[PDB]
Ligand binder design. Structure first.
Ligand SMILES: [N]
Ligand SMILES: [N]
Ligand SMILES: [N]
Ligand SMILES: [N]
Lengths: 123, 8, 123, 8, 123, 123, 8, 8
């Protein structure tokens, strides 16, 4: 009961993460890039631990955005792997991998890595 | 060059 | 039409990936660890590029497994970020991130990284 | 120590 | 002439990075963990771009610490890959990989990933 | 005594790694890209565990190449983080991070990730 | 469990 | 586009 993940999350660079955490471990919702128009909206699906440790630091989760919508297609997918931490300083700490489909895999610009911190309010 | 994840 | 992703994929270490690629970009199905019993089966959800480049090397995708089922809970989630490449040597080339929920994020054993190659037949 | 992703 | 990398850098968690950037692209010096005693001091070696782009955002570099000194041995090595950015808000933005020697490579706890921001003054 | 790391290593894509492991934990030598001419040769420096576990799987190490030589400058640095495993199937298992200096760090094409297996003979 | 890189 | 690490 009561995951605290459902709702709107903001990264530090203007992007928005709108998710519902279902009883079952499902994550669904919409990733909106910093441009924040119709073109900037992408489906996200993932999973989370619906029964985290009571001692633990957080709730493991991950999700995927394939960078294709009704408006445009960047022929790529990002996965975020991270942990929800609750409290008045609620956070989703993530690391991400961006893979491009087009790129020969063991060439330049195949897979990018970085990190994102999500908070309940913008910076 | 460009990608929506990093757009300003 | 015709993604070539739907079906059963095997990594090089005994694990199995059973997925359906929907018209819309949805990935759904089951990740089975090398032990290959009921306890070893986990839900996976993700996304893929339902309209890849015609020139391109491949189809970008990603998926998440939260390591919780009816039998056990490893309080963690893995995301695979990669590319499907078709042909008689069909492949899914991936890199993965495993995050543990329990672990203080900027401590030891928070996030692991590695890589997996999936093929239509076992090694 | 142990994790299902790497089980033999 | 004048790399701005030579000197003492602090990450956000109490660790210290003491480096000399030689004319030639050499990085040498000492990594000191947050405990900040004799036991906490490790050799670092790496490389940097001794002729960065004049337009560019920064100076590419990387370095390695093998976690063995006269006092203790964690049988592991971390590499930091990043970029120096100059100005009054001088920074080294990094991502790191920690590999353990002992661990069977395609098992649990083989390679960790994370990120570190270094600044000229502590947080 | 006797690290087994000193010598010539080949990755699976035509690249060459020529290293000396000093008594002290130093790695020094030359990285040669698949083109294998004068222009293709770069300094490498790193560290390794000069006293690995006797039970253990391997010897932790890492090294850095800054992609600048007398001939050309790609304004970037790669770090390899990995483990040497001895025996008649001797191997260096690595994961790598390639950072570009020029690129605004939290933009597209800042940091790439991948993996390389090194063996004593080419594929 | 423990590692010097993350020590308090 | 291009980078020496991946050159053919
Ligand atoms: N933006
Ligand atoms: N297994
Ligand atoms: N610390
Ligand atoms: N090559």
């Amino acid at each position: 009961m009561e995951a605290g993940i459902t709702g709107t999350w903001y990264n530090q660079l203007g992007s928005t993460f709108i998710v519902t955490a279902g009883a079952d471990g499902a994550l669904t919702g919409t990733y909106v890039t910093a441009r924040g128009n119709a073109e900037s909206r992408y489906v996200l699906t993932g999973r989370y631990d619906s029964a985290p440790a009571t001692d633990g630091s957080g709730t493991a989760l991950g999700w995927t955005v394939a960078w294709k919508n009704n408006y445009r297609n960047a022929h790529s997918a990002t996965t975020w792997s991270g942990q929800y931490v609750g409290g008045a300083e609620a956070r989703i700490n993530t690391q991400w991998l961006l893979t491009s489909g087009t790129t020969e895999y063991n060439a330049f610009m195949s897979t990018l890595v970085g990190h994102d911190t999500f908070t309940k309010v913008k910076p | 060059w460009s990608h929506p994840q990093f757009e300003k």
